[PDB]
Design a protein around this nucleic acid. Sequence first.
RNA 1: CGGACACGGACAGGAUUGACAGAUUGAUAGCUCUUUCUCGAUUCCGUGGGUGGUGGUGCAUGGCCGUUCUUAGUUGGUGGAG
Length: 118
Amino acid sequence: NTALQEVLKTALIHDGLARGIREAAKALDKRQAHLCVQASNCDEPMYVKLVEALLAEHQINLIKVDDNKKLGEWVGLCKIDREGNPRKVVGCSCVVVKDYGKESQAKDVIEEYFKCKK
RNA sequence: CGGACACGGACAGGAUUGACAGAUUGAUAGCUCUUUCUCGAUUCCGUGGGUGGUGGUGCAUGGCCGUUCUUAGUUGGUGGAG
Ligand SMILES: [Zn+2]
């Protein structure tokens, strides 16, 4: 009840992610990948095929979330605003975390990992 | 581009930087082209708006300077004359 709601929010303040239309499916080629997250709304079944092509045989875990636009208020391009339009992003389908930087509430997402995925 | 900002568009399922080789050039200017890797919201597109200019106008001006002007010249106050 803590995993899906707020402990992924606390890993998004100024952490490393993907951003824009040229590096979303990029960070799997690097040896700095912590917890990543992929949408269960992807219009092609080859993009999600491409991200599981690496991580399923390696040390990297995807979280299946609802869509990518709802990750748009997660990535950092702030469109929820007082005098601004609350629909400006078409958000990311695959962001990663290079590094946590702080250790407030990061145990709970990795506790989700080795609880069932072993 | 060294066109700031403001709005909209473009916009993670593909906005934008940079670049080896070669016809390509005056030029090892990725200038353009063929091919293809790379850069991480930085931008790019449109519209308003700045901005820059050894661009005009010295008869729109300021400031400085030259000149009649190297000669002795100039002016109020108060009385007097009109
Ligand atoms: Zn002119």
